[PDB]
Amino acid sequence: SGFRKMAFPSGKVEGCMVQVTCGTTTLNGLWLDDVVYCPRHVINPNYEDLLIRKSNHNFLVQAGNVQLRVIGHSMQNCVLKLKVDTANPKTPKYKFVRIQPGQTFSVLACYNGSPSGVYQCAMRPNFTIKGSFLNGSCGSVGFNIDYDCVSFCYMHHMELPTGVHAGTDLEGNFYGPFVDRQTAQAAGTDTTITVNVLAWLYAAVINGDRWFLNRFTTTLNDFNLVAMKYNYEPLTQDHVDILGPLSAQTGIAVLDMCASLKELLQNGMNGRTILGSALLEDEFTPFDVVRQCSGVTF
Amino acid sequence: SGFRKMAFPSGKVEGCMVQVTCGTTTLNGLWLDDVVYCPRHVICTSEDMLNPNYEDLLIRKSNHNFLVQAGNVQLRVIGHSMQNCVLKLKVDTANPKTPKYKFVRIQPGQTFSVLACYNGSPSGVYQCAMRPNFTIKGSFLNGSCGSVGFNIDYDCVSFCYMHHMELPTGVHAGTDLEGNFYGPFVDRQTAQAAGTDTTITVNVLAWLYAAVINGDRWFLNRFTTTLNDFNLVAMKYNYEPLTQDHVDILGPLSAQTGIAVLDMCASLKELLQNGMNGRTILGSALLEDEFTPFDVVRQCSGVTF
Ligand SMILES: O=C1NCC[C@H]1N1Cc2ccc(Cl)cc2[C@H](C(=O)Nc2cncc3ccccc23)C1
Numbered sequence: 001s002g003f004r005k006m007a008f009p010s011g012k013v014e015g016c017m018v019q020v021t022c023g024t025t026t027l028n029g030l031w032l033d034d035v036v037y038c039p040r041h042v043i044n045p046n047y048e049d050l051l052i053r054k055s056n057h058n059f060l061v062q063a064g065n066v067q068l069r070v071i072g073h074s075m076q077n078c079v080l081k082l083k084v085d086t087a088n089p090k091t092p093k094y095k096f097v098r099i100q101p102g103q104t105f106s107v108l109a110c111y112n113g114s115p116s117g118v119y120q121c122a123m124r125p126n127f128t129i130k131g132s133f134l135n136g137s138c139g140s141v142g143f144n145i146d147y148d149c150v151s152f153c154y155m156h157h158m159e160l161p162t163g164v165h166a167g168t169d170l171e172g173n174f175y176g177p178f179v180d181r182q183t184a185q186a187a188g189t190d191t192t193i194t195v196n197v198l199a200w201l202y203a204a205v206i207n208g209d210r211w212f213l214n215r216f217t218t219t220l221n222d223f224n225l226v227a228m229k230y231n232y233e234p235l236t237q238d239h240v241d242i243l244g245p246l247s248a249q250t251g252i253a254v255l256d257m258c259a260s261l262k263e264l265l266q267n268g269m270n271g272r273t274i275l276g277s278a279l280l281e282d283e284f285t286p287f288d289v290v291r292q293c294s295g296v297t298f
Numbered sequence: 299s300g301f302r303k304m305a306f307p308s309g310k311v312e313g314c315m316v317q318v319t320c321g322t323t324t325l326n327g328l329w330l331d332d333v334v335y336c337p338r339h340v341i342c343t344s345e346d347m348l349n350p351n352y353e354d355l356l357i358r359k360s361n362h363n364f365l366v367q368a369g370n371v372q373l374r375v376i377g378h379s380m381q382n383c384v385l386k387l388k389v390d391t392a393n394p395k396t397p398k399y400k401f402v403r404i405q406p407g408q409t410f411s412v413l414a415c416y417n418g419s420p421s422g423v424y425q426c427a428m429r430p431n432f433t434i435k436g437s438f439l440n441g442s443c444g445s446v447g448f449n450i451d452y453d454c455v456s457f458c459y460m461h462h463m464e465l466p467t468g469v470h471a472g473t474d475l476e477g478n479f480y481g482p483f484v485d486r487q488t489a490q491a492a493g494t495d496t497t498i499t500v501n502v503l504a505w506l507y508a509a510v511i512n513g514d515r516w517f518l519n520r521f522t523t524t525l526n527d528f529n530l531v532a533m534k535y536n537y538e539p540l541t542q543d544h545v546d547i548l549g550p551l552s553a554q555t556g557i558a559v560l561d562m563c564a565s566l567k568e569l570l571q572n573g574m575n576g577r578t579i580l581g582s583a584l585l586e587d588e589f590t591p592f593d594v595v596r597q598c599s600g601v602t603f
């Protein structure tokens with residue numbers, strides 16, 4: 001029993017964190033094989049013009065108390081790739097994956113190439129992440145673990161004026177309409193991840209919280225007309241199919257649970273909580289719920 | 299900016315998790331140097347659990363009855379002893395991944411990271427607090443026994459908890475790494491219940507200071523309170539008494555924000571009376587009590603927004 005916001009064990013990623021310094025700027029790098037990946041802003045910026053003026057010895061890479069020798073450098077989108085002389089002996093089995101809004105991941109927050117904390121979060125529909133970062137955190141990474149393979153999905157680049165965060169996949173493509181420069185940028189209006197709230201309502205039923213269940217059902221179209229009113233993301237037939245396993249386990253059809261969510265949106269919690277929360281939680285995917293309510297290991 | 303429930307990086311602890319099997323029971327062990335620590339109830343049957351005589355059950359065991367597995371490698375047990383509710387299995391190999399460590403016993407209100415494990419394999423990490431009633435609100439299934447709680451301030455791992463059991467309300471009970479239980483619990487399937495729980499007042503105050511540091515002040519008021527008047531009000535909402543030690547502990551956050559501890563106590567009294575009125579504090583519609591004053595200073599900036 002119990003339901004916590006749970007992150008993946010961070011050990012495989014900790015063995016990849018390094019400190020990258022260029023001039024007066026220090027940030028974090030990800031050392032995989034003989035390449036160190038980091039935000040290109042470590043160097044109106046014309047990044048190819050700024051990069052051509054740098055030599056390998058301008059980039060100081062530190063792995064623990066050991067200095068790594070940079071033997072090459074190249075840029076791929078908004079990520080800088082520093083070729084080093086030594087392959088990381090702690091390199092795990094890995095993949096670079098781009099995630100979709102609504103998907104969750106673990107973040108290993110780092111300062112000076114040293115991991116300080118791990119938390120779980122979701123890629124918001126507006127492509128920002130509600131993270132917890134201070135100056136020095138740039139280059140910190142987001143990941144998931146599938147079996148023994150670490151899938152890297154995020155690298156931190158910046159904080160927006162509202163306190164939310166923006167970054168790229170490991171190929172340097174930003175999530176959202178952001179650019180890596182000091183300019184006027186704002187996160188768009190955010191929405192609630194509907195399929196994740198439903199998965200979290202199923203997790204509450206599994207843990208014995210059923211006060212919000214009712215005898216009613218709804219059509220998908222009527223639910224989407226109501227959900228569009230409360231800034232909730234539209235629920236697709238794919239989301240319904242994805243919630244199939246949890247529907248079979250609890251005996252509550254996905255549209256039967258949508259009628260519960262509709263009543264919660266129009267009437268509120270009424271002083272009650274669900275899994276210790278007075279708000280509807282949207283940072284647990286259907287897979288996160290099944291994994292935490294089954295004990296899958298890495 | 300931002301405020302998340304943050305756990306310590308679990309790598310130093312992952313390299314210590316092993317699987318311990320005794321007969322039909324399998325659970326987790328902590329391998330440090332040449333010793334594997336695990337709940338002593340690994341020697342029990344489900345029948346034995348009502349009134350187990352652990353000393354009588356242990357004397358009947360030999361070293362070869364305990365199967366210890368570290369990854370895909372079988373460890374050789376060369377000795378065994380019991381210390382309170384923990385079983386200590388001496389093994390023939392020292393763990394090469396043993397970090398710098400300490401065994402620390404924590405007090406209620408203290409927070410720590412839990413690395414939940416099944417079959418000696420880590421599955422997840424979360425942050426939690428030792429409740430005033432000595433239970434923890436964890437996320438544990440069958441097979442999680444032996445999973446550990448820890449803090450990693452600097453590069454040293456301080457082990458503070460080992461999971462032993464789930465109570466009827468779904469909350470969890472366990473011991474420090476010397477086998478002493480937190481709370482009035484026993485490793486027996488006898489009728490045991492968690493006492494009525496209360497809110498960790500010093501932690502809610504620390505979290506209100508974290509909100510002020512992150513730029514939120516909607517909940518502040520022009521009032522102050524005496525410590526005694528605050529405690530008379532707080533007791534009525536099932537909040538733990540706030541001691542002078544708690545006031546002293548909140549001194550640094552009071553100096554950083556410019557809000558006296560008893561002035562912050564007046565905002566808290568008002569929040570309890572009024573509720574939030576559709577507003578949130580650090581993305582939460584409830585008053586959060588699982589961030590200590592030390593967690594807030596560690597996570598938050600030194601410059602108030
Ligand atoms: O009555 C029981 N019901 C399930 C098995 C059994 N347990 C009695 C018991 C009594 C004393 C001691 Cl020290 C350990 C234990 C064990 C325990 O509680 N294990 C668990 C531990 N954590 C989270 C669980 C979730 C779900 C099932 C077990 C869980 C076993």
Ligand SMILES: [Cl-]
Nearest residue numbers: 403404405408
């Ligand atoms: Cl303590």
